[PDB]
Design a protein around this ligand. Structure first.
Ligand SMILES: [Cl-]
Ligand SMILES: [Cl-]
Ligand SMILES: [Cl-]
Ligand SMILES: [Cl-]
Ligand SMILES: [Cl-]
Ligand SMILES: [Cl-]
Ligand code: NI
Ligand code: NI
Ligand code: NI
Ligand code: NI
Ligand code: NI
Ligand code: NI
Lengths: 117, 116, 117, 117, 116, 117
């Protein structure tokens, strides 16, 4: 995940940040205080950016030609995942955070299949 | 974990980073090229620091006074965990990586108990 | 402070960042411009976060088991200081920035004693 | 490039970092001092990582479905560019930096065609 | 620009970041949604800070005493440029973004003269 | 120091980071372990870089045109300090860390005068 390569990767890193994104979006419906809303927006932006970075590192550093060969939809899925995270940044609606998580979940299934044997 | 509070924590964040530290240590044992050794040292330093931040965060942002009362040894455990990580930082021996992982696993145990 | 170890520590690093937090809280009371309010919120989150990092570093990298023996309340003190910094992140009230300073002043008092003996 | 979106992007950001990567690799053949070699390796790693981040941001934030439609090789080219930057990180040979630059150059031509009308 | 020295500099790094500042200012004028305004404010602050770092770097790491002698006004220009960027940070008016861009263009002019 | 402006500045931030630089240079003379030498090199690059940021910040965000009028050599002084910090990044010799400190001490002297009048 660090590009040594160390060969340690886990889509859980991207998932956990994306789970924070959604958690924040949900908290934003419960407290209309301007200061709270602003801190939530600041922190959402950061966690969504870290999520994007973890997704991108998987795609660049972990996934290799035989994976792209076996999963020809994987390039586009990764791109759709990043754009869903951007749409989450730009939105207070938890449905957008959830969409990002659903995409990451497709990445995680593919990841673990490639880790098998 | 982002201090909103957002309420999402998982010691897996510390864990995966400390696993990377150990993995890098293991690889340093295999290949003595100076350039590689240096890159491994750079990376190990980053990963260990990240792991420390995650551990420090659980301690300050997740754990609360009722937990420190029920687990009177938790402050020292977290301190020892951070010191273990500093020691893995300073070392190429994967056993130091593993010691940090062992301490993290003690924290994870407590963490999931408090989730019940 | 850099974990080499280099042996250069000073709670002044935590203190100056916590002073910035309090000073930003004080400025927010003087200008209701929503853009200023938002920038102040961005800056206060960052500074408070750096203050927490400096405080954690002292506890993990400077203080050692004999210090914890001699000051059995140091563990809880450091935890309280970080929670006070998080409470100031979440607030516009300078009294919260002050409270974080109060705790930092207690750590600073212990620190300099350990530099004597 | 910041994901507002601000709509300001330029592959020159990724190019300039990748030009530093190569410059460092070339400087590494001229001075065998261990300390110099170490600082060069440290700085190479950083600039290659920033290059990767600029390439990834183009792919995720600037490029859109009609671009991927018109350039069906663009996903793979971006992936090859990132791996070339990783191979540059892992290498003292300026030919690896140059390969990363040749890839970025293909991205830059495509970028500017999509910016036309 | 990375302090090796690597010898690669281009005021385009400051420029593109300051162009992003101005672009964000322009967009703030178009859409008064609070969430959007906040995100624009977050981003503008980051981009402006990055631009400052690039400018400060040219000044310390690229420019040398012979340049400061040939261009006695360069120290003040760079200082003014950083202050312009701080002012764009504090403002939603794209004219402040443009002022910072104008100062950067003065630096770029001098920079390319010294490359000849 | 955070560009709000918040009005909290102290050259002690630059000073403590430059002390770390010098202290790391001194440690490198005491332990020839190649792994230690490399970590010391990593840490010294980072600390020196933070010191340069703190020095630049004072010059850009704290000092103002009347200060530059009263101290016409302040511009060159700040430039010299940053070049001295870069020279210490590039060196193992503590004399270079010391020189960076010497310059910082001169800025600190001017700073506190401007806090009086
Ligand atoms: Cl890797
Ligand atoms: Cl939290
Ligand atoms: Cl230390
Ligand atoms: Cl964008
Ligand atoms: Cl340079
Ligand atoms: Cl300020
Ligand atoms: Ni890795
Ligand atoms: Ni959180
Ligand atoms: Ni240190
Ligand atoms: Ni942008
Ligand atoms: Ni450079
Ligand atoms: Ni400030």
């Amino acid at each position: 995940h660090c590009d040594l390569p160390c060969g340690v990767f886990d889509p859980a890193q991207a998932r956990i940040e994306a789970e924070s994104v959604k958690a924040v979006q949900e908290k934003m419906a419960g407290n209309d205080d301007p200061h709270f809303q602003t801190r939530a927006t600041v922190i959402k932006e950061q966690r969504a950016e870290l999520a994007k970075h973890h997704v991108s590192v998987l795609w660049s550093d972990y996934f290799k030609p035989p994976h792209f060969e076996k999963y020809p939809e994987l390039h586009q899925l990764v791109n759709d995942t990043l754009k869903a995270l951007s749409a989450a940044k730009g939105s207070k609606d938890p449905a957008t955070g959830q969409k990002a998580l659903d995409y990451i979940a497709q990445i995680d299934k593919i990841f673990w299949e490639t880790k098998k044997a």
